[PDB]
Amino acid sequence: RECDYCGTDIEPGTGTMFVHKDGATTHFCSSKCENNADLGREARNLEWTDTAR
């Protein structure tokens, strides 16, 4: 699988799956990405993410 946030490949047997209110599913690779998402930051605007570069 791939991270619905940064875009790196989530190492199997690792990660969290957040289920939104509507039912949407967001797979996160680490706590860092979850916390950046909670800050209202969009993955495209950050330079370290694979989504941007």
Binding site: T14, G15, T16, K21, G23, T25
Partner: protein, 132 residues
């Protein structure tokens, strides 16, 4: 009970205010007890995803309010662990009111459900819109 196929970290306690994910008229549920549970001294009796709990209707319609009914924990904020090691967490803590035969009291279920709850309580599954 039948194995869930997931390791749960009980996110609720006795006295917790949760959401009622159905059309029964009940908006907010308060946990009173957890079926088949026996604690230890000083421990607050804990409830989690897939547990059959006893609840009291806090907020809702006059006819539904103050009633002591049984329910099933459908969603929880604290993460649970799936066999492939992945953690799964929800936006809220929710439960669906159930009867003596484990059939949902309402007709339509609001919001998503976990697949392990669906496997355990079948009539709640075949009433669920989304199963994650």
């Amino acid at each position: 009970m039948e194995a869930l196929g997931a390791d749960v970290t009980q996110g609720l306690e006795k006295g917790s205010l949760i959401t009622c994910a159905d059309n029964t008229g009940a908006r907010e549920l308060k946990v009173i007890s957890v079926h088949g549970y026996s604690g230890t001294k000083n421990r607050h009796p804990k409830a989690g995803l897939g547990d059959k709990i006893t609840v009291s209707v806090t907020k809702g319609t006059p006819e539904m309010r103050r009633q002591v009914l049984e329910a099933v924990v459908v969603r929880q904020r604290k993460p649970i662990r799936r066999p492939d090691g992945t953690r799964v967490k929800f936006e809220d803590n929710a439960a669906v009111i159930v009867d003596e035969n484990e059939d949902p009291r309402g007709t339509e279920l609001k919001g998503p459900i976990a697949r392990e709850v669906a496997q355990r309580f079948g009539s709640v599954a075949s009433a669920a819109t989304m199963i994650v």
